[PDB]
Amino acid sequence: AKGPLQNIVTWDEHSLFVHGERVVIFSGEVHPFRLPVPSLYLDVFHKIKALGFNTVSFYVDWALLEGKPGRFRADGIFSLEPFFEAATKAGIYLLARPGPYINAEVSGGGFPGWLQRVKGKLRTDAPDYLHATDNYVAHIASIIAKAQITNGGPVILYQPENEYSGAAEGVLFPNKPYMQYVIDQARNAGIIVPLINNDAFPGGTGAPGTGLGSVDIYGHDGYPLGFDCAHPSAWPDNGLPTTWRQDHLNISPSTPFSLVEFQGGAFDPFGGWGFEQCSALVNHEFERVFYKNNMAAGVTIFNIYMTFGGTNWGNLGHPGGYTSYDYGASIREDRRIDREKYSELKLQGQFLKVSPGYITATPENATQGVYSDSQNIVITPLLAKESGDFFVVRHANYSSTDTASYTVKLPTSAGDLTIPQLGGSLTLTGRDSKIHVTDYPVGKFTLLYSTAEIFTWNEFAEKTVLVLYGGAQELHEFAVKNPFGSSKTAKAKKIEGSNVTIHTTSNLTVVLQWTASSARQVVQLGSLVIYMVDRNSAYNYWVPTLPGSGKQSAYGSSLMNPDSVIINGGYLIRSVAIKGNALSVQADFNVTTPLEIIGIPKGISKLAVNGKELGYSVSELGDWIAHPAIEIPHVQVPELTKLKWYKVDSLPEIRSNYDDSRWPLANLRTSNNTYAPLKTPVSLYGSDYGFHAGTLLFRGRFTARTARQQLFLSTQGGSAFASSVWLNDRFIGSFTGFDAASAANSSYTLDRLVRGRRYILTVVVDSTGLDENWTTGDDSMKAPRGILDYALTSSSGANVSISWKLTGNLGGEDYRDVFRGPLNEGGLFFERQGFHLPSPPLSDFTHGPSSSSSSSSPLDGIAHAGIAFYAAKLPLHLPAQEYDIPLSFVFDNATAAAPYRALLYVNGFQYGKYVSNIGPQTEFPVPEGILDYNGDNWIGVALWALESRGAKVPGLALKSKSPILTGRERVEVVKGPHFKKRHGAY
């Protein structure tokens, strides 16, 4: 790596530059494959843009786009085109991360299952691995090359590989010819923007100056609280990073300090704590302490992993997680933005994008008792000669929940000052951190200093507006250099409030002190107006940007200090636009509120909200106060217990009349799997036959030699898998599973056999996905699914032979549903036939009345070990044009009940794997778009009873959240194919 290849995106020691403008890149992670509704990408981008972010980072999952080797497919819900269109419509730029290896808590870490048939070590220069990646990278890097900013699209940065940071003992690391082959595949496909990487810690791998294999910008990661959410109020001793500014200078001083993945929540395993508990550990207090600690090191490329997580639909997840990927993130799985951490993150994003002096100040070592007399606080300075200083204040023990009183002694253009200058003490309450400034520019005005934090500021036609905030009951002080210009007449004017005090010095510096509360203070100094609010009021302010013109209109006038309107009130402001003499606002409301508009453009005299004209009062400052109609209705949804349910047996294999002559034979006498050498006469691994998704079945034939025989069976499905075994139609037993078991050794007696007669063993093995491969040189993704070993012995000790057949999803790598993708279906009978699809063939099902002997409802269930599938029509007629109403399906977990596993289907898409004896998930959200809110829907529930007594669902209900009055763009329903009879099915 030797410099940029184009002039649109460039960099230096301090920052990136875009179209020649220095910018702080503040980015959120979103994964397109975890939200398969193209018309909702714009809703998520409106919510990230309103935080004050300018960028989104995204993975691409190889396993979804090349499920058959040699056939790349990215159409319909798998296309990136509507994701790229929505980024341009919202005015957001993108960091593309296509792998080939992505980790991401997805099945295989992104590697398709057919890589288990590749002999050489993954993520090395073994030639069989390298040549297996060539077709995927050629197609995906060419799609992303067309969407680059150099061709008028949103793509500004590209990451090759993922977290390439160490290796197993006796494996070459770093392997520099391997790193350079990965970079060459991307360059050869047309990628010309800069390359960035994401090292696990500051190890220096791939940094500029390391020769063969190096990227353009060196990046690293940080997850200082780790991933166990057991104790959400405990922060470890020594858990805060204090060496990253020095480590950056030691490794790559020539490029911007970059955190390519920094903690925005945590993943959670089967048997874990739930994402509500993860959101309480990684909360608004975590954000203000740890994120301002990264600003104290001078970060200028900063991405939050995850910002919106979405859902692991259609088996796309790994065994180490379950269906939800909410992550405890700032935007929830259902797209609501009510968590307090969303409102706190907005305060930080709007401050940085109005503060260009931050980029060029130089960070220095942390100090104690230098910038304050107090030794109970620590202060890290960022210094510059004239353009402004910043100071990040925290408790000396970073974990402290105590309140500290303090003063500061700060350098300014008027000399060193102890502040407050008008008397009194500052306060730092528990788990808080503050940025104080000196010589901070506000358009044509200058703040000599401020202790209160800056939300936003802008210059308008008739005034300049500044918005400052403090936590409630905190004393704050700030000073403004002479705001009156020439006039030795002019004086301050108090417009609102009775707590603020104003003192003027003889050189006309104006000093203001106030105590923050619910009651806003407002003061006018000449044409400068200052609004002084508490933190909780600042949470409801918004700063939408005014559009420019042409294809790039949503990117506004510039990325830093853009033309804007300031709005006080509302659950979300999405956008503003000018049309003749009217200002038009798109907004969402979850509660009643007025709206106050500050900074009306010149010549505008009418107001509309969501397409409707309304009147307004005018304040003496020229702000407009308006009262939109907000009705929040009572919503009624259909009761699921009252639908007309139909039922079909989904284990016909154990019946005497069953014909398996269409099933694949398991007759491979050798395997290419080098990680798990064969212990059996033939391979019983699903991936050796093309089956990589969901449940597997095996059928083993033997001739009885004695009346009693003993069976040893070793099975493997991934963490929290289960397996069940039948001998003809007789149930033998289940391994019922637990969070800590990925494999099981079982021993069963097969009794009462007739000598000389043929018997068939049916073995069902669930898979919860393919494992990741995060240590290069340990091929852990190749751990097989199915049967690892077995022995069948007569009562005299002789060995008895078994011959085998097997199946996963119908067709394997030749998968049948091209619209919904290669992983959506597993191998259970109802899936192979397509009976999960809309408009199923009801003459192949049964119907009977609930709470009777012949019930066809999942609330009544089945009375023996086995597997049944249930389907019903669900009509919806909700006011989706005017309201956003989030819907979810809820299972009741009733302490005393037999163990079972369930699968949830909606309009043909699998939207849940429920495991009653492992948990933690009971509530399953499904998005508008997969659901039709004004038409018929088809719902599906598979039920697998693990014990001899059978099982039932104790309760199942549809739940709504409080409705949101909405100005989003309309959601289009995803039109997946309905049932059609499948030729060659079994």
Ligand X SMILES: *[C@@H]1O[C@H](CO)[C@@H](O[C@@H]2O[C@H](CO)[C@@H](O[C@@H]3O[C@H](CO[C@H]4O[C@H](CO)[C@@H](O)[C@H](O[C@H]5O[C@H](CO)[C@@H](O)[C@H](O)[C@@H]5O)[C@@H]4O)[C@@H](O)[C@H](O[C@H]4O[C@H](CO)[C@@H](O)[C@H](O)[C@@H]4O[C@H]4O[C@H](CO)[C@@H](O)[C@H](O)[C@@H]4O[C@H]4O[C@H](CO)[C@@H](O)[C@H](O[C@H]5O[C@H](CO)[C@@H](O)[C@H](O)[C@H]5O)[C@@H]4O)[C@@H]3O)[C@H](O)[C@H]2NC(C)=O)[C@H](O)[C@H]1NC(C)=O
Ligand Y SMILES: CC(C)S[C@@H]1O[C@H](CO)[C@H](O)[C@H](O)[C@H]1O
Ligand Z SMILES: *[C@@H]1O[C@H](CO)[C@@H](O[C@@H]2O[C@H](CO)[C@@H](O[C@@H]3O[C@H](CO[C@H]4O[C@H](CO)[C@@H](O)[C@H](O[C@H]5O[C@H](CO)[C@@H](O)[C@H](O)[C@@H]5O[C@H]5O[C@H](CO)[C@@H](O)[C@H](O)[C@@H]5O)[C@@H]4O)[C@@H](O)[C@H](O[C@H]4O[C@H](CO)[C@@H](O)[C@H](O)[C@@H]4O)[C@@H]3O)[C@H](O)[C@H]2NC(C)=O)[C@H](O)[C@H]1NC(C)=O
Ligand U SMILES: *[C@@H]1O[C@H](CO)[C@@H](O[C@@H]2O[C@H](CO)[C@@H](O)[C@H](O)[C@H]2NC(C)=O)[C@H](O)[C@H]1NC(C)=O
Ligand V SMILES: *[C@@H]1O[C@H](CO)[C@@H](O)[C@H](O)[C@H]1NC(C)=O
The 81-120 contact track toward ligand Y, x by CB under 6 A, reads ----------------------xxx---------------
Sheet with 803-807, edge to edge strand ranges: 730-735, 723-727, 758-765, 696-703, 803-807
Return the residue of 7, 151, 188, 233 that touches ligand U, per CB under 6 A.
Answer: 233
Write the CA distances from 783 to 63, 117, 717, 772, integer angstroms: 16, 11, 9, 10
What is the signed CA dihedral for 18, 20, 21, 26, rounded to 10 degrees?
A: 20
CA-nearest of 244, 207, 221 to 303 is 221
21 is in an annotated binding site: no
Q: Binders of ligand Z among 365-424, rule CB under 6 A?
A: 403
Q: Is 105 annotated as a binding residue?
A: yes
Which residue of 527, 672, 775, 917 would you call a contact of ligand V, by CB under 6 A?
672
Q: Is 838 helix (H, G, I), strand (E, B) or coil?
A: coil
Residue closer to ligand Z, measured from CB, 517 or 590: 590
Binding residues for ligand V, total number by CB under 6 A: 10
972 given a catalytic annotation: no
**Is 261 tagged catalytic?**
yes
604 touches ligand Z (CB under 6 A): no
- The answer to whether 303 touches 262, Cβ cutoff 8 Å, is yes
String of contacts with ligand V for each residue 677-716, x by CB under 6 A: -----------x-------------------------x--
Tokens in use for 32?
């397109």
CB of 401: closest distance to ligand U in angstroms? 4
Binding mask 397-436 for ligand U (x = CB under 6 A): x-xxx-----------------------------------
Which sign, positive or negative, has the C-alpha torsion 158, 163, 166, 168? negative
- Binding site annotation covers 59? yes
Q: Considering the rule CB under 6 A, would residue 74 count as an interface residue with ligand Y?
A: no
Q: Which of 624, 658, 738, 979 binds ligand X (CB under 6 A)?
A: 738
How near is the Cβ of 104 to ligand Y at its closest, in Å? 4
The three-state secondary structure class of 280 is helix
Nearer to ligand U, 430 or 652 (CB): 430
Q: Has 261 been labeled as part of a binding site?
A: yes
Residue number, 29 or 477, with CB nearest to ligand Y: 29
* Beta carbon nearer to ligand V, 216 or 688: 688
Round to whole Å and give the CA distance between 99 and 182.
9
Residues 196-235 that bind ligand X (CB under 6 A): 227-228, 230
557 or 674, CB closer to ligand V?
674
Cβ neighbors of 230 (< 8 A, separation 6 or more) are 273
Residue 888's Cα: distance from chain center in Å? 19
Strand partners for 887: 960
Angle between helices 81-90 and 41-49 (to 10 degrees): 30
One-letter amino acid at 421 equals Q
Site for ligand V in 724-743 (CB under 6 A): 743
76-113 residues labelled b (16+ CB within 10 A) or e (exposed): ebbebebbbbbbbbbbbbbbbbbbbbbbbbbbbbbbbb
Q: Which of 1, 5, 126, 200 binds ligand Y (CB under 6 A)?
A: 200
Out of 93, 267, 290, 391, which residue is the one contacting ligand Y (CB under 6 A)? Answer: 267
Which of ligand U, ligand Z, ligand Y, none is residue 163 near (CB under 5 to 8 Å by kind)?
Answer: ligand Y
Check if the beta carbon of residue 43 is closer than 8 Å to that of residue 337.
no
Question: Which residues partner with 362 through β-bridges?
Answer: 383
Please answer whether residues 123 and 117 qualify as being in contact, where contact means their C-beta atoms are separated by less than 8 angstroms. Answer: no
Q: Is 102 annotated for ligand binding?
A: yes
Q: Which does 739 bind (CB under 5 to 8 A by kind): ligand Y, ligand X, ligand Z, none?
A: ligand X
- Residue written as tokens 């802008």? 458
CB of 671 to ligand V, least distance (A): 5
Per the annotation, does 197 bind a ligand? no
Quote the crossing angle between the two packed helices 127-146 and 176-188, to the nearest 10°. Answer: 40
CB closer to ligand Z, 536 vs 775: 536
568 labelled as ligand-binding? no
Residues 858 and 845: their CA atoms lie apart, in Å, by 14
Residue 702 lies near ligand Y (rule: CB under 6 A) = no
Q: How far is CA 390 from CA 302, 360, 430, 628, 742, in A?
A: 18, 11, 21, 40, 51
Strand 956-960: give its sheet, edge to edge.
923-925, 887-891, 956-960
Site residues for ligand Z per CB under 6 A: 280, 283, 285, 338, 340, 343, 403, 429-430, 432, 471, 536, 539-540, 571, 590-591, 962
Site residues for ligand X per CB under 6 A: 227-228, 230, 269, 271-272, 320, 738-740, 893, 895, 916-922
Site residues for ligand Y per CB under 6 A: 103-105, 162-163, 198, 200, 221, 223, 261, 267
Site residues for ligand U per CB under 6 A: 233-234, 237, 397, 399-401
Site residues for ligand V per CB under 6 A: 117, 668, 670-672, 688, 714, 743-745
Active site residues: 163, 261
Residues making up the binding site for beta-D-galactose: 59, 102-105, 162-163, 261
